[PDB]
Amino acid sequence: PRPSSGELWGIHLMPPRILVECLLPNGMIVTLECLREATLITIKHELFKEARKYPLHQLLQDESSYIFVSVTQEAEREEFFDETRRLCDLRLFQPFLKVIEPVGNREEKILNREIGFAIGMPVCEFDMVKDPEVQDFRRNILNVCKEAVDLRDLNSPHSRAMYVYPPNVESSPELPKHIYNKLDKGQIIVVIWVIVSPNNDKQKYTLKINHDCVPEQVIAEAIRKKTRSKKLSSEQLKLCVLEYQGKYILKVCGCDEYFLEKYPLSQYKYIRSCIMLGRMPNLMLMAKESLYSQLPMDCFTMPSYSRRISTTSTKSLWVINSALRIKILCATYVNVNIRDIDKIYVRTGIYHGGEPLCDNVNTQRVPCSNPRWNEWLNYDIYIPDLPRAARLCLSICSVKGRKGAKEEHCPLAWGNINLFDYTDTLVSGKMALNLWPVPHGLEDLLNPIGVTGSNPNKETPCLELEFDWFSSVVKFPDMSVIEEHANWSVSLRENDKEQLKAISTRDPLSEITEQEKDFLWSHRHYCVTIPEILPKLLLSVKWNSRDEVAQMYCLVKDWPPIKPEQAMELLDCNYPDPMVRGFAVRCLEKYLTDDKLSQYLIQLVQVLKYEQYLDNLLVRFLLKKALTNQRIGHFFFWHLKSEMHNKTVSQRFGLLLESYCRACGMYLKHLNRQVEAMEKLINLTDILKQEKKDETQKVQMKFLVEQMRRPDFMDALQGFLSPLNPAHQLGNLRLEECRIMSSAKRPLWLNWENPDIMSELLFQNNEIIFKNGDDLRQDMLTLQIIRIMENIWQNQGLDLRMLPYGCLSIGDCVGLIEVVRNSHTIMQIQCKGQFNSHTLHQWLKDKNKGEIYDAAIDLFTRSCAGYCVATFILGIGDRHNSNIMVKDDGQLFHIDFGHFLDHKKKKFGYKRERVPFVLTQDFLIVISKGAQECTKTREFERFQEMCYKAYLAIRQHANLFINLFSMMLGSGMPELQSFDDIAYIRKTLALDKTEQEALEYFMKQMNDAHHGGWTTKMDWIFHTIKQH
């Protein structure tokens, strides 16, 4: 288990000096001893000096006439045009260099190498792909690239600044009451800083303005205060302000977050946070010009592959008068133990999303050692009834029948195929399909949620199929044809209206009866009056009848758009129809704010895996957004890149990343600095986890220290943007604060200076944990959900302070984690109290003496309520004093989630909804400020109502969370695999109960788990206030 992807194949680090084989153009070979960090400029020069001592030396030209080519660890022939790169940074397969005269389109070659580096794969690999769908994607997606780059450079330089520095804003300007009341009669105090020439002194202005004010008005007020002493005519003043108002721009002190857009100030997230937290907003004023000057010109260039030439009886599907027939021929091999298995067979099914369009069909059973069927399988479906998104889902299965009449079936390998290709052609003739390994945890014989297409790895079980032929190319019919047919397919009410409404208010995974379906379908024209019933109407549709589908098409054509929160459902694995999904994208296009798109990016990227084809409306929409807003583009890039190792999506994500990198402008050089930083950190931790694993910590710190001081390491790990938040610039490393953490995977705790000139006001330290070895996708998802919960609560005037710290997966079990400062585990706290129940409260007291004591209690209480409710709903793996933390100012939060939903049911069998975060007496004592009888205090009653409100607020937004989890089923998370996995949150949110029953259920859970203490200020009959 020791192969390495370091500086050479098989070697993590080059020795300080190394022999490099140099292949001269005259056929000679010169062995040169090189410093591992020497540049190619040095090496080339040293080589051509030495080459004089070798034969046929006169045939060599000026060294300036040549560059180096070699083989990289990706087995590409790479030409080294940038001779300032270091030998150790080249990613050589083996230490040799070949001398050639540079040919060809240099600028394209250089840009393709930069793209290749960014995405983790040489773009030349794309040119080899025979699949017409792939080459068509590459060419056709370029339109979206051009449309974005044009739209970016249109209103220059302002439209460019907006692309690079988009406004970080909330989704509405509307202030919740708990926020507004913290203002001073609707006004905020802000501090505006200016760097004055010539000594770059810092001057401070404290302003008091309406929260409403646009940045330009903030600047206006600043001009007023500045010219206070130099008194003038009010008209010249009002006109002075008017003339120079748009001469400056505002910036958050400490990070690269600008206010370039006329949103009200309080709608900016930084400012909104400052109000909520009672923190002084510190902004920096600068001339518009000193920003617009920085902004790189982004030029987009049409690639070569857009400049190449690529080389009658077309029957409507609907006039093919036959049943569906598919032939299973043979499979090359299975890996089974012949002694443990009786027979193998191929299982098949025709699907629309997760629903079978007819019954599944097995081949006959045959011996393990001879996988041959030659069988036409007959499906109970008429070829013209095949919906556009129909798929063949299959598996090779083993069967063992050794106990009674009982047998055990196991899928060995699976594969899905679109019945129509991306041009609406019904597949025909022979096909060979390389199958995929069955996902860990999956027990079903088919895997219909899985991606379609052949396993690119051709050293895998290969199934030969054959589809029917109709002596002609067969195509899905035109929209004109379908629309016409619907017309000719179509040739108490107060109770009905109120029942439809009731059906529409239920959650996406709510049971719908056959009665309700026939009811929905029969009132389909009336359903437009309640447009958000669309998902349920769609699932009432019989997708195996062209008659019904044609009619359903005519409805979604004119369907009124519905909110993003609901349209996203139509992009999960249950709604595969290209019209249905088009409608969904149109809703996103019109109503999804950039803020919400960023908020839900993780899910929107994941549902790309569900798309039948490379080219679709969703991917064009996402790429467009990624290319018109760089904060979206950054995370777009990193979410795609982090999965490039997963062969089920690396083609699709690779092609998508290529087109993004080609058009993203200068930000590609910033991303390349991030990727090389991450690559160095992977290599450094690989060494610690492999070579040096049986060494002590002290020795490991010695090695770490000497490595980080090397020029090639310093160069790469200083002066780049944080991938967690690229508004944070990572400057010089503070080596004395960097360290390897104690845990097993060997995380690195890294610390950078912030080169922002006003870093003392905010983020003096940028600290990150880099972790190589743990799968971080579940933490990232859980932290995301917490963030969304917190945002829901805030919007309802519910101030429950959560701490959804940054966690970013950046590749296969590798990621970054934000460091939360001044925070300690409960265990650590009890260990510095010997400790009773009161140690925690006492700890908190000492850290918040005097007037600030109550603030800490309050903050502890609110954060406690938020995590109590969030963990209950999500079923986070049980809490203990090591995965629960508290800050010095009393903010409580949780870490290390790594387990959720009904994972425990599947392991132990016990059918129960746990209460993961049980508030022990330690916590109760804090909330009650030390009272003897904690549950009977007003503070505990206040804490309770917080929990009740928080709970109902998430329940009221149940659609959003069910849809967000549903979009993850195809993700590769063992814990999040079927809709049955999402059933757990339907339980905790008590979605099949009334709201009042739901709150009753929540109180009953808390009581059972805390053994009493949770009381109602309602009467049990009407839930009306009975006290105070």
């Binding site: 192969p3 292949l23 070979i29 070798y54 133990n337 055990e408 049955d980 099949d992």
Partner: protein
Amino acid sequence: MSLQDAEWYWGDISREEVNEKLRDTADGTFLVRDASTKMHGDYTLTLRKGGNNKLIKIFHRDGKYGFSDPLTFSSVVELINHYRNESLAQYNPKLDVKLLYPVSKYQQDQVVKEDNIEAVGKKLHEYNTQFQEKSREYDRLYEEYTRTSQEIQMKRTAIEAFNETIKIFEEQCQTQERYSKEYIEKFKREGNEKEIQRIMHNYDKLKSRISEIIDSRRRLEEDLKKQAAEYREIDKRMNSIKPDLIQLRKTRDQYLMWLTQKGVRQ
């Protein structure tokens, strides 16, 4: 004749529990359970049709019961049998299938034949123990499978890199041969012998270099072969224990349910 003693009436089991039971079964398979609302009167019939589980609400008003609006029954048992013999076109005239295979409580509980709560408890302990053990093994195997898969990919990519490398060194040889021949003819014709051997010496060096690189690739091909064999054996062993591990889990879940049932309830 009573709802409770009916073999297909399963009480308060979930949708999901029914999905598991009706999974991959034949058309006509059915069962009845409490509604997911738990409104104390409403029950749900679940029927297998065309590879799909159908939920049919059982409407309970006055003293009657009905699929459709005309409430024309008196017990749930009545209704199920009335459709169990005749066709289901009476419900809705489209694609009648009636009700032909019932998922029975009774064949399930024969799996657990221990008399006392202590006999059951003890066998639950054994099965649970075996299950957590055999889970652990299978998890361990999957990690090895995953590590082995990755390494094989690295090695495939490394073999391609050797192939490209070897090609380039072979090109150098051809380059050296294109050139040197017109010089050996001249260094002989002009007396120099040491310069000739410096050419030959560089050619020998290149030749031996190519031969070491070719052997290195040969050795990697051999390792790839061995590891490809380990990989398929790891796959065999996972294929062997998967179905046994599934069965065992259902047995554990069954005893646990059985224990629950013969324990105090509230």
